[PDB]
Amino acid sequence: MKVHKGDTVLVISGKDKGAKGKVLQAYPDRNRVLVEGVNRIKKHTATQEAPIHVSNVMVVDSDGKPTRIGYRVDEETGKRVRISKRNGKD
């Protein structure tokens, strides 16, 4: 995954398609993440958010529509800058 806890994503598939929210947790090998307010589970003791597979979401560029995460050349003493297409900024 190219996404971490500080990113906001849009659900692009599934019954929750259209939902946005902040990433709360990630499980790399499973490639599943927790997103506030997406897949609710009406079970508590004995609306809990469930992990969803990354390919059903797309990272929002924080400046409009969903975008694809890309990399460039910057380095600057060990610092990989993460950008995107269509006016990438971070």
Contact residues toward RNA (CB under 7 A) are 1-5, 23, 26-28, 78-80, 82
The two tokens of residue 40 are 């609710």
Residue among 30 and 86 whose Cβ is closer to RNA: 30
User: Cβ 64 to RNA, closest distance in Å?
Assistant: 22
Residue among 18 and 20 whose Cβ is closer to RNA: 20
Cβ–Cβ < 8 Å for 39, 49: yes
User: Cβ 51 to RNA, closest distance in Å?
Assistant: 12
Amino acid 55 reads S
What is each CA distance from 55 to 20, 29, 47, 58, 68, in whole angstroms? 15, 14, 23, 7, 12
Q: Which of 2, 22, 24 lies closest to 11, judged by CA?
A: 22
User: Cβ 86 to RNA, closest distance in Å?
Assistant: 20
Residue among 23 and 38 whose Cβ is closer to RNA: 23
